[model samples]
Target: RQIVVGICSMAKKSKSKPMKEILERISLFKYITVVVFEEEVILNEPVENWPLCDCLISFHSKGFPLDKAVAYAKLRNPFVINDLNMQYLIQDRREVYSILQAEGILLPRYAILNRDPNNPKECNLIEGEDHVEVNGEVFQKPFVEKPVSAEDHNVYIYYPTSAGGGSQRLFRKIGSRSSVYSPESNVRKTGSYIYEEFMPTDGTDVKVYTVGPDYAHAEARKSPALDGKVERDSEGKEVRYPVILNAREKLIAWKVCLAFKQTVCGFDLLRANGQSYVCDVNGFSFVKNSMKYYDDCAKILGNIVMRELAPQFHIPWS
Candidate 1:
């Protein structure tokens, strides 16, 4: 049996070098046929002409044209691992965080702001007024301000101003005292922003990847400062913690995956007070070979596909 995998070319372009390495790993599986497509021209081509494969693997990116590909894939009746609608689960930060908190999952305290004077703002701080008033409110000062939409591109931790003209960037630590402001400018259009009571954890965070309904792998990301930017180097060399999943973290990650109803995903978590806080959720995370964790991810993904397509496939693990 042959499995046709359709990969989003846009995602491949963004992480081309690392993706190439991932491709090498997948090539080892002689039964899988990979089809790469450019997002911009996805609709231009006909799906019927593609190989008669059993499944499709969608590797999404920031600007990938997912809507078109998803619609076309549905018409073909091929099993799509991570479906299109599932992507909308984490489209809104507010909703995702709410789901986490409701599940008894620990997450940073946050409030949503609707800065339009015509619409005004709603619950601009985390915990609303009652909780804010109770905790001495010190940590709320330097709350993070991120566009409810397009959060991946821009993020700031700042104070809210009374005038409410535009968003002001605060350079203080992650959890410090500062006023927050909501802007009415078209550039700063009012929607919703998160103001969370920051919790520091040795300036480190973790990225956990989940494949199928199980946890695949995780990495420990360290930042020089509370607000410093940290990313993987071209060589995928970064100080990472060993592969160990506790019951709590595993359960929380599992719930998130269930919520999204996705086969492959990633979650950003911050450890604080002996618990992990759900910071962000990524719908289109990749398995790059440049990192030591790549092999683990690939194996997990391969196992997932095998199980889904062929229930008889199994591997013994002691």
Candidate 2:
């Protein structure tokens, strides 16, 4: 039996090479085409003659053309990795957290603030004044605040002073002199955020990349930058590496991924006080084969893919 798989990605980070490799090993795909959105003729193609693919894989897609292509996919209903609903969930932090939390997946103590001036809900502020309160029910010291929609992309930490006593700090979005974040949050500064308690993870983070929701590929590493500090290579480019994840870490990682219905996504997990917490989720995440493990990230991806998609297919040729 044969099928056609569509590949959607940009020139800068094309997964076509590895994806095609996987497809070949699967011994399928009647035809494979790299559908690049950058093509100038995309819009000019007659609407009725749009490309037809049995299944499609998308990566880091954005812009008007991609949006148009996606709408078309909805109508076609081809199996899509990181389908529409899952993709939307990836971009939403508050939604994922609430849903997963309701499902009992472990996560850090957190809260959100709506930045809509008309419907604004503030955090880290004193009662009716611009003061920072360390002793509060909503949030405490050693906490971090960041955008709930695109969490972990940017973070600001506020740790209280040590002396067996609370500190009176200033917050721009705080209660008087007790102003808020050193780097004001998009929620307070923009529109929405998840303010969470900070935890110690030995200065490293874990990322578990999954395929079709079950098979996982994981790597642990410090961020290109850390604790508001940047660790750059000689060329001044930031650095990152692949480490390892313990059994329990992998356990919780898989738990959250499956719970979230993110069949083909990656998630960032953290540890504090010997427990795991999911910090961020990546939808339709690419397998970074550049790391040097996994001989071909594509074959494993392709292999697992067949297991997921085979049930949906029938082969007349044995």
Candidate 3:
């Protein structure tokens, strides 16, 4: 039996070291054929013109025609690594939380703030204040405020006057900086947001990457909310050391992978007071610098793809 694997991503990402390695490994399989569909190709070509494959690995990218690829997937019904539709749901914090909550997955107690059309003055209530009320629910200071849209990476953690009054802003890494602290104690007054209880983790942020429902890799790093400094290694990559996951944490990983329908996924894990909470979920993320992890991911993914396509051929291999 022959298996065709189509990789759809921008040239910059598909040709990167990690992605190149995985593609190469999968190509080494005797009955497997790997195909590449760069950004321009997927953008310019019609769905019917796209090459056929048994499985397609595509992820979200800026300016990429994700909707078209999804349409293609819907028409082809190929084995997709991560459900393409779920990618859109993950873009909204509210939707992500609702999905996680529906599955009984624990999350930080949070509330969404949508501006009232008739009562626009209500939006001003959060400015320069230590607390804000949304639908009679009060979110006090020392809480984290995040834009409901995941694309807006500007997350704010406001501290009470007793904690030296200020706000730490976390954003995408620029150079060696990931966040900045300022004296602005008030939340942003302009946009809708999600405010949740801040679970302090002693300056540690745990990142978990799952390969399958049962296998996951965990790493720990200094929380960017701590002091806005990013520690880097010789390669200029953020330094992260592997960590062991507790039984409860392990369950969280499995639940996230299954609920999100992301065979390969990355999520932010926070452990406070011996309890675990997932702050965010990312689709199609891979570990940066682990040869063993790369090999395992390739092997496991190969088995999964093969298994998904096997039944059609009456194959009995696992």
Off by over 4 Å in 3: 116-128, 314-316
| TM-score of each model, in listed order | 0.73, 0.72, 0.95
For model 3, what is the C-alpha lDDT against the true structure?
Answer: 0.85
Stretches of candidate 1 off by over 4 Å are 9-15, 46-52, 116-139, 159-191, 224-243, 287-292, 311-318
List lDDT for all candidates, in order.
Answer: 0.59, 0.55, 0.85
lDDT for 262 (candidate 1) = 65
Query: Per-residue lDDT of 11-91 in model 2, one digit per residue for the tens?
Result: 443435544445444444222333433333335554245666666665444432456556658767776655555566666
Which numbered prediction scores highest in lDDT against the true structure? 3
Winner by lDDT between candidate 2 and candidate 1: 1
Model 1, span 22-123: residue lDDT tens: 656665665665666554455456654544445666645556556756666777766777777666556777777777777787888766665655664343
Q: Write the per-residue lDDT of candidate 3 for residues 1-318, one digit (tens) a residue.
A: 688888887777788888888888888776678989866778898888888888988887566677988998988888998888898988889899998899898899888887665765666344436666665677777889988887788999999877888899999889989899989876776678888989979788899999988999999999999998999999888888778999998998999999999888999999887888999987788887788888988888888877888788666676
Instruction: Score candidate 2 by lDDT.
Output: 0.55
